Structure 1
Amino acid sequence: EGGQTPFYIRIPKYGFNEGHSFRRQYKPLSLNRLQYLIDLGRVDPSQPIDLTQLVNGRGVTIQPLKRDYGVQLVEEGADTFTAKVNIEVQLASELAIAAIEKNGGVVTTAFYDPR
């Protein structure tokens, strides 16, 4: 800025990003999307839905190398979800647990290390 102290140096530091490379990330899998994938025949609800079968149906795109650890079910679309699925994900809000149980479904949260 011509010698005047630059704008990006007169504003104090704060840990907006400290640790960002190690804060784990999870790709959402909304119930809307799960229903949409089930209907069009991409995932198969007559077979346990793990991460492999979510990806082999191109339902979510997992990036291991960017510190994604897995999927998280999100409550969006709890209404209108009608499917009997045995889904294994890496997180779940209690509303998603409900949405999967109310229709006679089992949901289990597993863990997967980056390797």
Structure 2
Amino acid sequence: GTSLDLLRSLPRVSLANLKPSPNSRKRERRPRDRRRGRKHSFRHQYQPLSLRRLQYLIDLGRVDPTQPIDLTQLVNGRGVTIQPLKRDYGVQLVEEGADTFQAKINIEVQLASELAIAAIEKNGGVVTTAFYDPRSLEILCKPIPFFLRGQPIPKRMLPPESLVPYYTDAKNRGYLADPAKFPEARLELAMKFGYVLPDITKDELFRMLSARKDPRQIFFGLAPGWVVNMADKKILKPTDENLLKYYSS
């Protein structure tokens, strides 16, 4: 680096030596002389994640492959930008990147493409859709702030009747779908592509992959109505029977 050789020879610089960069400041006009003398909200704002965008995150290890894909982990990994002021209500995927995304992993997305569901299932991944209230989702993305407020974990909300058919639909793989149809449905999807269906039970981590939280339960780790000892880095569970009635209500 011959540039460094120039620096060593040069004498110490001073405050007065400072000079503005070339073209940094344009000229200004002042009247001192003659120069200037004389003279849609209801529809969910679904935010998609592309399969190609999905693949690189796994490739870079931005999201742990062992851990099932979780929207919060994507937020923790800065995968997508969500603004509560934008009032984003939905999450989905981009059809692009189907043939550049060869991977299998458990994942839950508010919205999943029917074609995409089979492809990841063909690879061996597990896909389902869960409903997070826009207010609850904003709380979900930022857990620490409501702990500072002192708010306790509330029960997860349910979709409006307009979106109930989607979640209840078996093909949509919503948590409101009938589990009895899932075995039949999974076989049907395999036949559609024709690939040999790999049973999830065969997987060693089947229980981890297939684990699902209650519809009322916002967090798989934390049951609804729970409290967290943020100061003590611990979890606090209510012991009042009336609180259980409150949760039941």
TM-score by length of 2: 0.37
Paired letter, 2:65 = P
Q: Tell me what 1:63 maps to.
A: 83
1:102 aligns with 2:122: yes
Superposition pairs of residues 49-88 of structure 1, within 5 angstroms: 49-88=69-108
Q: Is the 8 A contact 1:74 1:92 kept in 2?
A: no
Corresponding residue SS for 1:64:
coil
Q: Which has the higher contact order (CA 8 A, sep 6+)?
A: 1
Name the count of aligned residue pairs. Answer: 96
1:64 deviates by 2.8
CA distance in 2, matches of 1:66, 1:22: 13
Distance 1:62 1:81 in 2: 24
Aligned-CA RMSD value: 1.3
Say if 2:75 and 2:81, in contact at 8 Å, map to a contact too: yes
Q: Select which of 32, 36, 52 maps to 1:32.
A: 52
Q: Greater strand percent: which structure?
A: 1
Q: Which has the larger radius of gyration?
A: 2
Unaligned 5+ residue runs, structure 1? 1-19
TM-score (normalised: structure 1): 0.76
Higher normalized helix content (fraction of residues): 2
Residue 70 of structure 1: how far off its partner (Å): 3.3
C-alpha displacement of 1:44: 1.3
Counterpart-to-counterpart distance in 1, 2:83 and 2:106? 23
CA distance in 2 between partners of 1:62 and 1:70 (Å): 10
Q: 1:105 to 1:64 in 2, by over 3 A?
A: same
Shift in Å at residue 38 of structure 1? 0.8
